[PDB]
Amino acid sequence: DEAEASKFVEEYDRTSQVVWNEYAGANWNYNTNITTETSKILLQKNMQIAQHTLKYGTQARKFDVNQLQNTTIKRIIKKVQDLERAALPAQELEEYNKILLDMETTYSVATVCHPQGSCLQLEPDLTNVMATSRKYEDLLWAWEGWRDKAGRAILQFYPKYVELINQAARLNGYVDAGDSWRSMYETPSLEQDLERLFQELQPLYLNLHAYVRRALHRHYGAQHINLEGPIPAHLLGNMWAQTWSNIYDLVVPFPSAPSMDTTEAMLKQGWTPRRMFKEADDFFTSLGLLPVPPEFWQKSMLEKPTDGREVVCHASAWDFYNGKDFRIKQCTTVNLEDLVVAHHEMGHIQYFMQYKDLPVALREGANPGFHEAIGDVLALSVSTPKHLHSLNLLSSEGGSDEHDINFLMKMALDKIAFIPFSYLVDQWRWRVFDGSITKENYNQEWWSLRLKYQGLCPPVPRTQGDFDPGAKFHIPSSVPYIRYFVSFIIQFQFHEALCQAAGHTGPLHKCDIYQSKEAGQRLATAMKLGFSRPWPEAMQLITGQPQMSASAMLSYFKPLLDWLRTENELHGEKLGWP
Numbered sequence: 001d002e003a004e005a006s007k008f009v010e011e012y013d014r015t016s017q018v019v020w021n022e023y024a025g026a027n028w029n030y031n032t033n034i035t036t037e038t039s040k041i042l043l044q045k046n047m048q049i050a051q052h053t054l055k056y057g058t059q060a061r062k063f064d065v066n067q068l069q070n071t072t073i074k075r076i077i078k079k080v081q082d083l084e085r086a087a088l089p090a091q092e093l094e095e096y097n098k099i100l101l102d103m104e105t106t107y108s109v110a111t112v113c114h115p116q117g118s119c120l121q122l123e124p125d126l127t128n129v130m131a132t133s134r135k136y137e138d139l140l141w142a143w144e145g146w147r148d149k150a151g152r153a154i155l156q157f158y159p160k161y162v163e164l165i166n167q168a169a170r171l172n173g174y175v176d177a178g179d180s181w182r183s184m185y186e187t188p189s190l191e192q193d194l195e196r197l198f199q200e201l202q203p204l205y206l207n208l209h210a211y212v213r214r215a216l217h218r219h220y221g222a223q224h225i226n227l228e229g230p231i232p233a234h235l236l237g238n239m240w241a242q243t244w245s246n247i248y249d250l251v252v253p254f255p256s257a258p259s260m261d262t263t264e265a266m267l268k269q270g271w272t273p274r275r276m277f278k279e280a281d282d283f284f285t286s287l288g289l290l291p292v293p294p295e296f297w298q299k300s301m302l303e304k305p306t307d308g309r310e311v312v313c314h315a316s317a318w319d320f321y322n323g324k325d326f327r328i329k330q331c332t333t334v335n336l337e338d339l340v341v342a343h344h345e346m347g348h349i350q351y352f353m354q355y356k357d358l359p360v361a362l363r364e365g366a367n368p369g370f371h372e373a374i375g376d377v378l379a380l381s382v383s384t385p386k387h388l389h390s391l392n393l394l395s396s397e398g399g400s401d402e403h404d405i406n407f408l409m410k411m412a413l414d415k416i417a418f419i420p421f422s423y424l425v426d427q428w429r430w431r432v433f434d435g436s437i438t439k440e441n442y443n444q445e446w447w448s449l450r451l452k453y454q455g456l457c458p459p460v461p462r463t464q465g466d467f468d469p470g471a472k473f474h475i476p477s478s479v480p481y482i483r484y485f486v487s488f489i490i491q492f493q494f495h496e497a498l499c500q501a502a503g504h505t506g507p508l509h510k511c512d513i514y515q516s517k518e519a520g521q522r523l524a525t526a527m528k529l530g531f532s533r534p535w536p537e538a539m540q541l542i543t544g545q546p547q548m549s550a551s552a553m554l555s556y557f558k559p560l561l562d563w564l565r566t567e568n569e570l571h572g573e574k575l576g577w578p
């Protein structure tokens with residue numbers, strides 16, 4: 001009995017490695033070369049992996065896991081009992097796979113065109129407009145145009161996608177797809193836990209929001225900014241207003257303490273995408289962590305092809321499930337933001353390499369937020385003025401309180417501004433999946449949450465037929481989002497713990513863990529666990545305690561909270577958007 005279950009997981013692991021490796025290859029070939037042929041091969045491989053999933057999932061469901069003694073075998077078998085989409089009848093499975101491919105293709109090839117003019121792609125063209133234009137009408141054209149082309153085109157697919165992903169979830173024992181996604185955390189209190197963390201970040205977010213709102217009022221004019229209302233969503237430097245650091249120039253706390261133009265510094269000094277990933281590789285190996293294999297440099301797609309190919313440009317990291325072949329696919333631009341993206345993606349690769357000797361069923365992060373946090377933790381140190389100066393991308397900014405608050409503001413524009421965005425995406429999707437939001441009010445309920453949590457409003461009233469969530473990658477690609485909220489909380493917990501392990505003293509935000517082998521050892525021990533244990537054990541290995549907690553993020557930003565309260569007080573800001 002115990003013997004049959006052990007043999008079963010060994011057979012599952014051997015066959016899964018082969019089949020998943022073949023699927024990853026076809027998926028990569030489409031993502032890096034969108035054509036009719038690669039799409040047809042991918043859809044064929046979808047049916048092949050579904051045949052495998054159904055074979056072994058059916059066998060797994062014949063084991064009574066209650067009666068099994070070994071907890072690891074119990075854990076693997078319970079997981080394999082979830083067939084995901086392979087639980088669907090063949091007709092519905094084929095339809096679902098086609099819908100998913102059609103949605104992700106639509107998003108990745110959408111363009112926004114001037115009339116009798118050029119056509120802009122999201123990356124780099126529209127991204128650059130949102131980041132650098134300071135003309136209200138030009139930002140509006142990009143913001144509205146992207147939603148008109150990408151968002152509206154996804155709406156035809158989304159109701160059927162919801163029906164089918166929910167049907168698959170119910171056939172695997174869940175009430176709906178959102179229930180199945182939340183289960184990845186193995187934390188029954190997840191919704192309350194995340195709500196409590198969100199509430200703890202409200203003082204910081206509300207003060208940052210009011211300060212930025214004031215600065216936008218100064219630049220774009222009193223007729224366009226209501227000092228007691230929500231901020232128009234196209235003015236924050238980012239297509240989704242999810243991170244705001246590209247408008248640092250408008251909101252600099254101490255303009256008498258100017259910062260080097262990091263983009264021009266990277267270009268002037270001959271930085272390339274390959275150099276950016278080599279720097280990230282060096283940071284990981286400086287902690288005693290693993291270098292990427294030579295194969296990574298041969299097979300990765302680190303810049304947008306020029307040979308005519310259409311590609312999925314959205315950055316991602318790829319495990320080919322053979323313990324040797326790991327790759328990044330990124331349409332890298334030479335700027336500081338994409339340097340942080342490169343570190344994010346290299347953190348995924350590091351996790352892949354750390355747990356490569358686990359059975360594939362356990363080759364995941366402790367929870368999905370852990371997988372998202374690794375690269376960001378290192379990027380926190382990379383982003384310090386100390387480290388950036390050592391890269392010759394900033395001048396010496398130390399020994400200056402003005403520079404200090406400026407740096408904290410730069411970090412807050414990304415890290416704090418993202419908290420409400422990353423919270424609300426799956427608040428919306430969970431309610432779509434549970435049927436509380438129907439296609440009658442997809443977009444209205446999206447903007448109700450954009451208002452409630454982020455304090456943003458659409459610059460143009462939305463109309464029937466708009467489907468603005470479809471204009472955000474993870475929606476048509478069916479990638480869960482709450483992982484990023486979890487990641488932004490725990491990455492500061494990890495930073496705090498690794499800084500203590502490295503012997504750092506003084507303010508948390510001055511810590512740079514570069515070359516700390518003690519810090520690397522903490523991360524390595526946790527990453528090697530993969531998904532073999534409940535995530536509180538990995539939390540404990542890194543931080544010395546088992547809970548998610550906002551206290552580390554609050555500690556990091558405490559000096560900025562103090563400065564923002566003083567600044568907002570003396571300007572008489574009314575926090576929030578009553």
Ligand SMILES: *[C@@H]1O[C@H](CO[C@@H]2O[C@@H](C)[C@@H](O)[C@@H](O)[C@@H]2O)[C@@H](O[C@@H]2O[C@H](CO)[C@@H](O[C@@H]3O[C@H](CO)[C@@H](O)[C@H](O[C@H]4O[C@H](CO)[C@@H](O)[C@H](O)[C@@H]4O)[C@@H]3O)[C@H](O)[C@H]2NC(C)=O)[C@H](O)[C@H]1NC(C)=O
Pocket residue numbers: 006007009010070071072073357358359532
């Ligand atoms: C429950 O079952 C799990 C899983 O068992 C494994 O999978 C089954 C399907 C079946 O194939 C089993 O035969 C198979 O072991 C058990 O977890 C495993 O436990 C073993 C032994 O503790 C671990 O073996 C380790 O493998 C490492 C490979 O990288 C190796 O380096 C380790 O060696 C270390 O320890 C020796 C001790 O002298 C030391 O000399 C070495 O130098 C080195 O430090 C070690 O051999 C597996 O990694 C575990 N696998 C997983 C997935 O966790 C588990 O023990 C069992 N539970 C109970 C209560 O028995």
Ligand SMILES: Cc1ccc([C@H]2CC[C@@H](C(=O)O)N2C(=O)CN[C@@H](CCc2ccccc2)C(=O)O)cc1
Pocket residue numbers: 314315316317337338340341344345348372477479484
């Ligand atoms: C500077 C910076 C740093 C990090 C990001 C990350 C976090 C926010 C989120 C977002 O931009 O909203 N973000 C990505 O999206 C990156 N890319 C996905 C791809 C995930 C994927 C999973 C499965 C299939 C395909 C893709 C991934 O690495 O996690 C953004 C920007």
Ligand SMILES: *[C@@H]1O[C@H](CO)[C@@H](O)[C@H](O)[C@H]1NC(C)=O
Pocket residue numbers: 033035037038309
């Ligand atoms: C793109 O895909 C087509 C069809 O599969 C193939 O013939 C072609 O060689 C591919 N191009 C590249 C650059 O891989």
Ligand SMILES: [Cl-]
Pocket residue numbers: 240468469
């Ligand atoms: Cl939007």
Ligand SMILES: [Cl-]
Pocket residue numbers: 181184368369480481482483484
């Ligand atoms: Cl998730």
Ligand SMILES: [Zn+2]
Pocket residue numbers: 344348371372
């Ligand atoms: Zn990620």
